[PDB]
Ligand binder design. Structure first.
Ligand SMILES: *[C@H](O)[C@H](CC(C)C)NC(=O)[C@H](CC(C)C)NC(=O)[C@H](CC(C)C)NC(=O)OCc1ccccc1
Ligand SMILES: *[C@H](O)[C@H](CC(C)C)NC(=O)[C@H](CC(C)C)NC(=O)[C@H](CC(C)C)NC(=O)OCc1ccccc1
Ligand SMILES: [Mg+2]
Ligand SMILES: [Mg+2]
Lengths: 300, 300
């Protein structure tokens, strides 16, 4: 059981480079539109307190330099949608996959194609934290890298990288420019607030462990939804609902282990620790696998 | 700091499906040759004790069905090289990237494009263990999935998946068909032997932690190569050499922390445990990042 990203080839064909002034970052080229973070128009001084409407008014189509590999795209229109800039270009991307723009929920996962200067660097699998941050690896110039899921042949774009809030914690928007969480694209200190552990993901991962022969943690107890959620609150785990029980149905039926039974095992993991032992090669409870991720990786 | 795979698009364009009899698996289509595990010619009974030379003699070009998406490739020659079958087809793959075949060393890393029926499923980053196994996620029909590294525009293929030795541990060949380790492509029980922790990778990861602000583990001590390797042997860590010290040079110079100083810190991590604390969000020492992987992810 590995943390698996989606194959990134369909997204690789959409990455371009966007330059305005001296600032360069990544753009997503779909049909005849290039999407990128609006702060590409900012100077370093601008970023401390930008008036984006005023700043964009001083830019014309020809101040936006868009480069797809080594061919240069002619910008014929520009528009601000929330925190994203949409650059109308004169050429439809011939590599445009079937795609949708989706806004994901906290606790769902996606792949990130980290890019620099319009060039792919690596791919990794992320979860949208309950506090709407992402724990990623993003260096300067990675802005505009996108997060996505693939359903057969259709790419569902769900995230675009905008900013680093603190060491190792990042924030961004959907592809309509709306930030996930309360963040703004301004270089002023911003609080993310208390995060929580994604309970249903932890349970899915425990099922993954059972499916892969790892079962030391299974205990003699059961529990109730309410009894468990009292334990969940003390450990800053999200409350478990019947919706979550339902989504775990494939895993509970595959293993013959009732969800409430697994909750009892999790509760004892929480109150007693792991005692130097290991689950699926990890010494902490992993919460960045959704139930679908587990079924997917166990279905091929 | 995330475990990052290479962008998989260049490899996606080379995956095909290979069927012989009822057995189907993945093939790698490069130029006018398709590479795949030779056990595609085996029945379930054959796999218990195959005579591959005898079994292949009963197959002609037309018993090999090769499918690239929905177009079918005409097989005009077949050849066994070690444990790999090479199927000469009548069409060069128009998506063939610049590529090399390389045989990696234990402790080096690579990306795996897990595939089923010739179709990409996911990508993840792996290390070749010191005992020449890989800890991956491979279901039935994943054989022929390949491991690779990318240097700018050139794909270095280094691994092809052949078999599961035990729950969660896998074995395979280079692209010349030579198994990594002592394994054979036969369904008989096979020992992998004692694994060891990749010391130089652990040290690189500790540097990654310092680069990312995580430094609680840094201590007041230093040590010597010989003193440290006495501690390494007791904990089944590979001995550290001056070659390894040299490769850590970029990280030691970036952080201002001497390698032997970090070894002292690692030694105390080893003898005292982690005391419920965390390094880069992990509760165990991670050894599947090479020094180059760390420089790469810290260089963009
Ligand atoms: C885009 O490529 C780049 C990637 C970063 C990893 C550098 N992002 C930005 O340039 C972005 C532009 C502003 C207008 C949103 N700024 C940041 O991401 C910035 C980087 C940190 C290291 C300063 N983060 C930020 O401003 O968060 C708010 C903040 C302010 C002051 C102190 C801490 C946090
Ligand atoms: C290819 O797609 C497939 C992927 C496996 C994950 C199923 N591999 C094989 O079909 C391969 C063919 C043989 C001739 C190498 N067999 C295995 O991989 C087999 C699977 C296990 C679950 C039986 N592993 C194996 O034979 O290892 C040796 C062995 C034998 C007996 C008991 C334990 C281990
Ligand atoms: Mg912005
Ligand atoms: Mg074989």
């Amino acid at each position: 059981f590995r943390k698996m990203a989606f194959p990134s080839g369909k997204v690789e064909g959409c990455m371009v480079q966007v330059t305005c002034g001296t600032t360069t970052l990544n753009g997503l080229w779909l049909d005849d539109v290039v999407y990128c973070p609006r702060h590409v128009i900012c100077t370093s001084e601008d970023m401390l307190n930008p008036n984006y409407e005023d700043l964009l008014i001083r830019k014309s189509n020809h101040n936006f330099l868009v480069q797809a590999g080594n061919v240069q795209l002619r910008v014929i229109g520009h528009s601000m949608q929330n925190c994203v800039l949409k650059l109308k270009v004169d050429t439809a991307n011939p590599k445009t996959p079937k795609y949708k723009f989706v806004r994901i929920q906290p606790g769902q996962t996606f792949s990130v194609l980290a890019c620099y200067n319009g060039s792919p660097s690596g791919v990794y699998q992320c979860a949208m934290r309950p506090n709407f941050t992402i724990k990623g690896s993003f260096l300067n110039g990675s802005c505009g890298s996108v997060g996505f899921n693939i359903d057969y042949d259709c790419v569902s774009f769900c995230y675009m990288h905008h900013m680093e809030l603190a060491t190792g914690v990042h924030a961004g928007t959907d592809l309509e420019g709306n930030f996930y969480g309360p963040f703004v694209d301004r270089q002023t200190a911003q609080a993310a607030g208390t995060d929580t552990t994604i309970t249903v993901n932890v349970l899915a991962w425990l099922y993954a462990a059972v499916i892969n022969g790892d079962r030391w943690f299974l205990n003699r107890f059961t529990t109730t939804l309410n009894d468990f959620n009292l334990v969940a609150m003390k450990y800053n785990y999200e409350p478990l609902t019947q919706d979550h029980v339902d989504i775990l149905g494939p895993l509970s039926a595959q293993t013959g282990i009732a969800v409430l039974d697994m909750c009892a095992s999790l509760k004892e993991l929480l109150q007693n620790g792991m005692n130097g032992r290991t689950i699926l090669g990890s010494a902490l409870l992993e919460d960045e696998f959704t139930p679908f991720d587990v079924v997917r990786q166990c279905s091929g």
